[PDB]
Amino acid sequence: MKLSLVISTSDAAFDALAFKGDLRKGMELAKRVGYQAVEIAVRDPSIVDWNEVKILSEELNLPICAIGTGQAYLADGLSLTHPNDEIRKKAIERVVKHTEVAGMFGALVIIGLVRGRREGRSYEETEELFIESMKRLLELTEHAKFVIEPLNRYETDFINTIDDALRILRKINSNRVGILADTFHMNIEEVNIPESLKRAGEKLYHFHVADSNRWAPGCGHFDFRSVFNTLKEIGYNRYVSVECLPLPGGMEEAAEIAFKTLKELIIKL
Amino acid sequence: MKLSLVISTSDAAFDALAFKGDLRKGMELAKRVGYQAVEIAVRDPSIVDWNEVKILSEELNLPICAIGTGQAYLADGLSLTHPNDEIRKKAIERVVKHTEVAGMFGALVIIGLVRGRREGRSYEETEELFIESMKRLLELTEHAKFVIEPLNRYETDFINTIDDALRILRKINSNRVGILADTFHMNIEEVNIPESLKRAGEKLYHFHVADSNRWAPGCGHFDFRSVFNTLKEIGYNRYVSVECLPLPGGMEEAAEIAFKTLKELIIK
Ligand code: NI
Ligand code: NI
């Protein structure tokens, strides 16, 4: 099992210097604390100089293990299930650009809010549209790997649980799509989190950790012990990525507290 | 990767009934033999009835993966590098209509002979005119995807190799344009076909197969084994389309032989 840190970056649109500054600050922080990789989130990769990012990654010996895409939905309204097929196509085209970046870094592409919501429709239709978009993404890419992140009810009404995602993976039928489980979201949506992770098993490709209040792991009341016992049981050996609010005490303090909590859990199994 | 069959169809401006007849026959053959999709070529799309083509594709559960455009050049003299700007504009407008048809099917649009020849000009002038026309196409169409097919020296003096095409793709700078590599043309123009395909890599968007004599794969001396080893190595998961003479033994026998040859290479 490896540890990574999600770093927040300003949109490069906008303020290219701020994006670069944020990225370097976050990566230097991750390296200093001891993380083995970083995870990023970008709205539109077409406006970032990725050759410069590669140089930074090489300088710090810090791979980028995953790329989030949710700002494509929140800022730009792009959805893989949008009722307007024109926007659906634009969403697929945007995510293809994320996969081009992912290929440079060997990173996973996260399918979170970019999948879109039910918007008054049946779950069944929303699911069918989603599966069609994912199959198109697989046809459009030769190497990209995707992970679906179930999100809680306040963020979406489409794919709230690990079981929701597993049903979809069975329909897509590709080993290039797996599951990203997130402890903050699971704390709300999953009945029994160890049982949910056992059901995911080999399909668990990536893991987000934050405590119950989405603070650094250790600063709420989430039972990480049972979770890491289960991760060992199912042989999980990929990334555990800290995705938390900069609390308590700021981005640096939170990253340090998270790392310490997680290191102790990992080494004692 | 997936197998498709190129089917020849009559010009429907000349005989619309013959076009439909040719198309149905070709698609029924493709489905019968086991192909997963078909590929067609039309001179002028604005005179064909595509709704029906769609309901024909529907009832056979048989996608159309690519649309050829070369007859717009061979028959109508339309070229994306024509020195006459008025004809060049008409060529662009024709290809835009091809993209509207392609969008109905999620198909690729092939840029082969429609790109035109040097016609006494420098390679550089011809190339920049081409890039301009391609950028105009990208402006006039939103989702269309184009594939440039390098052709051998007897067919054109403009874009003969995969490396040619790659250099031009870099100048166009759009993931909406890629490469169609053809084994008959490559057998003449490429030094080392596996090395050329590896350089193309992810920019290899579509693939044409015919043997060295352009007969059904298996009926000449082209090394398909090394090609398919390479396609597997690079993770090619797109279409391999049979584009061959109806030889030996006619369109049906050639389609059968080609499928048998290629399926075995893909499976193993
Ligand atoms: Ni998360
Ligand atoms: Ni060809």
UniProtKB/Swiss-Prot annotation, chain B:
Query: What GO molecular function annotations does the UniProt record carry, in alphabetical order?
Result: isomerase activity; metal ion binding
Textual note on the cofactor: Binds 1 divalent metal cation per subunit. Mn(2+) is the most efficient metal cofactor, but can also use other divalent metal cations such as Ni(2+), Mg(2+), and, to a lesser extent, Co(2+) and Zn(2+), but not Ca(2+), Cu(2+), and Fe(2+).
Which parts of the sequence bind Mn(2+)? 149, 182, 208, 243
What does the record give as its pathway? Answer: Polyol metabolism; myo-inositol metabolism
Q: Does the keyword Zinc apply?
A: no
Q: A GO biological process this protein is involved in?
A: inositol metabolic process
What is reported on how temperature governs activity? Optimum temperature is about 80 degrees Celsius with L-ribulose as substrate. Is hyperthermostable, with an apparent melting temperature (Tm) of 102.4 degrees Celsius.
* Applications: High thermostability and very broad substrate specificity of this enzyme make it a potential candidate for the production of rare sugars for the food and pharmaceutical industries.
Keyword terms, alphabetized? Carbohydrate metabolism, Isomerase, Manganese, Metal-binding
Query: Can you tell me which residues form the catalytic site?
Result: 149, 243
List cofactor names only: Mn(2+); Mg(2+); Ni(2+)
* EC number(s) on file: 5.1.3.-, 5.3.1.-
Quaternary structure (record): Homodimer.
Function of the molecule = Catalyzes the reversible epimerization between 5-keto-L-gluconate (5-dehydro-L-gluconate) and D-tagaturonate, and thus probably functions in a myo-inositol degradation pathway together with IolG, IolM and IolN. Is not active on the enantiomer 5-keto-D-gluconate. Was also shown to be a nonphosphorylated sugar isomerase with broad substrate specificity in vitro. Is able to catalyze the reversible C3-epimerization of L-ribulose to L-xylulose, D-ribulose to D-xylulose, D-psicose to D-fructose, and D-tagatose to D-sorbose, with a substrate preference for ketopentoses rather than ketohexoses.
**What protein am I looking at?**
5-keto-L-gluconate epimerase
Q: Which organism is it from?
A: Thermotoga maritima (strain ATCC 43589 / DSM 3109 / JCM 10099 / NBRC 100826 / MSB8)
Q: What is the lineage of its organism?
A: Bacteria, Thermotogati, Thermotogota, Thermotogae, Thermotogales
